[PDB]
Design a protein around this ligand. Structure first.
Ligand code: XUS
Lengths: 99, 99
């Protein structure tokens, strides 16, 4: 599909058997999701943006379905105000910017 | 052009007669540029990111050329880690997400 940017590019995703709304964010290097109890190992990480940094938990090789397109890679989890799909997974679903 | 996301979608912009590098950021509602001098009046505002809120200077109806495409809109200036082009201008250059 094609998504215009009049509104926030929010889509439905499926992770860990749960459905959620997430922002397709070309400005986010990596995917960061709202707090969730994922199983498996993880590593502490800090990511920065406007306002400073937040501490997150980095889970590796996590499968997420974005609009029926499957994608597997790093997923960060922490106190983010929004579910954010970053470039690490946007590339796997063939998402481009066009103008 | 069509822009892949294997690297950061950075482009050259021209604002106030000066060239800069800026990130096409579909997750940003507004355009936020690093500290710089711009002519005209401005109002102090605040924007929130992943790490909290920052203080910015809001410049309205600012001419800004993004990768050869002209836009005239709101430009925030403040301590952002990176020049980001938000949806308020991405819409003006006809930018869409496609997968
Ligand atoms: C909503 C209630 O909370 P809130 O309003 C903020 O909500 C938010 C917070 C963040 C976003 C996404 C970010 N957008 C953003 O900064 O946009 C600003 C300016 O325009 C406004 O549009 C909405 C926010 C304002 C951006 O796309 C991505 N970022 C990196 C960029 C900055 C490159 C350095 S990253 O997130 O830091 C990030 C960094 C590394 C990794 N691996 C993953 C993510 C969208 C909405 O404030 C109180 C918390």
């Amino acid at each position: 599909p094609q998504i215009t940017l009049w509104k926030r590019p929010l889509v439905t995703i499926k992770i860990g058997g749960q459905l959620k709304e997430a922002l397709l964010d070309t400005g986010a290097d990596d995917t960061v999701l709202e707090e969730m109890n994922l199983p498996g190992r993880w590593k502490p990480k800090m990511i920065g943006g406007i306002g400073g940094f937040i501490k997150v938990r980095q889970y590796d090789q996590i499968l997420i379905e974005i609009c029926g397109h499957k994608a597997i890679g790093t997923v960060l989890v922490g106190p983010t105000p929004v579910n954010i799909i970053g470039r690490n997974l946007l590339t796997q679903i063939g998402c481009t910017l066009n103008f």
